[PDB]
Amino acid sequence: MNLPTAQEVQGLMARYIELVDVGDIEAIVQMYADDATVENPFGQPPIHGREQIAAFYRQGLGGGKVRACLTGPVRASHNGCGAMPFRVEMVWNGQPCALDVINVMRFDEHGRIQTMQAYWSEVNLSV
Amino acid sequence: MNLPTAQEVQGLMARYIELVDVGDIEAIVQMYADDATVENPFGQPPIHGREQIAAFYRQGLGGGKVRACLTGPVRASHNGCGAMPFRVEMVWNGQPCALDVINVMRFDEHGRIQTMQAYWSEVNLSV
Ligand SMILES: O=[N+]([O-])c1ccc(O)cc1[N+](=O)[O-]
Ligand SMILES: O=[N+]([O-])c1ccc(O)cc1[N+](=O)[O-]
Ligand SMILES: [Mg+2]
Ligand SMILES: [Mg+2]
Ligand SMILES: [Mg+2]
Ligand SMILES: [Mg+2]
């Protein structure tokens, strides 16, 4: 495919959340461009490339029990970008906890994620 | 003040929505740096400076009846930035309509909005 239309961005960004929710690390990594970046949380230096990105998702999702769900609709653009609000259910010290996040993505001219930026800080975590 | 902390960003971004909701155009414009930019919707060229920004808010809010409310929490950063999901209630051809938006902001070292980017496209509008 080419640069995703607004409707295609919606679909891709919702699919990303589905894949996080089901914990399919390999399928998530395949959504990214080979040389993509992830800034998590936004404010921290980017990681680069599918090896580093795979390591990020393995560290976050490797336990197999994380859940994630949109908390409202994707807001897409006409230039291959979008933003979405969601909540992640994780564990911490055996305590269930939830993290509220907004991801901002930009897709490349092949429909792959070029950049991901995850906005959140510590007060978005609730034990 | 200086560059807003994560907690200060939350407060500022929530205040912005309150001011949109109450329709205080002049107070909104005062939140912006003198040379700020607004990209609305994201994907379109920025407007620049408080004159152009005031004209934007007068055109959107000048009728006095718009409402706006957060639909989930602000996601702030530790570098003076944040993102938030909200819904705007407007009128169109005398029809009430709602627009789902995510704003991404960056604040300057004085606590004023340096950049605002409003993510939405036409399918985020509902008549
Ligand atoms: O904080 N995180 O781990 C995180 C942040 C944003 C995401 O889109 C996904 C994850 N995750 O896979 O867990
Ligand atoms: O579309 N709009 O008009 C819009 C978009 C984002 C905003 O933060 C505010 C407005 N408004 O004042 O109406
Ligand atoms: Mg699921
Ligand atoms: Mg490439
Ligand atoms: Mg109000
Ligand atoms: Mg300045």
Side-chain angles (χ1 to χ4, degrees), chain A residues 49-125:
Chain A
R50 275 183 179 187
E51 181 193 359
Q52 290 181 20
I53 293 170
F56 166 71
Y57 286 105
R58 188 144 298 280
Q59 184 54 66
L61 303 180
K65 292 290 189 72
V66 170
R67 303 299 306 261
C69 192
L70 287 167
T71 50
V74 177
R75 282 70 158 184
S77 79
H78 294 296
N79 71 341
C81 300
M84 64 186 162
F86 62 106
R87 173 171 281 225
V88 181
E89 320 286 335
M90 23 187 31
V91 171
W92 176 37
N93 271 16
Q95 298 171 302
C97 60
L99 183 67
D100 292 317
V101 184
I102 284 171
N103 280 3
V104 177
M105 288 176 179
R106 176 167 63 85
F107 292 84
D108 70 10
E109 63 268 23
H110 306 103
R112 296 188 191 96
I113 304 161
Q114 193 68 60
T115 65
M116 184 275 260
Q117 298 167 326
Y119 286 76
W120 60 268
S121 74
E122 293 88 349
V123 294
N124 295 125
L125 181 69

